[PDB]
Amino acid sequence: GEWRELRYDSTCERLYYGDDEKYFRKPYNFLKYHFEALADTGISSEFYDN
């Protein structure tokens, strides 16, 4: 999922994502690498005055 880092080409005036390495090999001992994306951010605030 990280195939969007950066790449520039001055001679061609071309700006695009680096297309060199987009593949991940899975060893035999690994079932699946489960490329996904989740995010849960929660802030808690408590202000009491007596």
Partner: protein, 49 residues
Amino acid sequence: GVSVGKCRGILNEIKDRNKRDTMVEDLVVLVRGGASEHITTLAYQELPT
């Protein structure tokens, strides 16, 4: 001649004051998809967008 006098005085003062204040805030975010740098930028809990 007989002279007699009597005097009496009393003062009472009571003061009471109470102040109570409370405020809390909570935040819950649930994002699925594209866990790259931009969604981490958007994961900023303080700013809403």
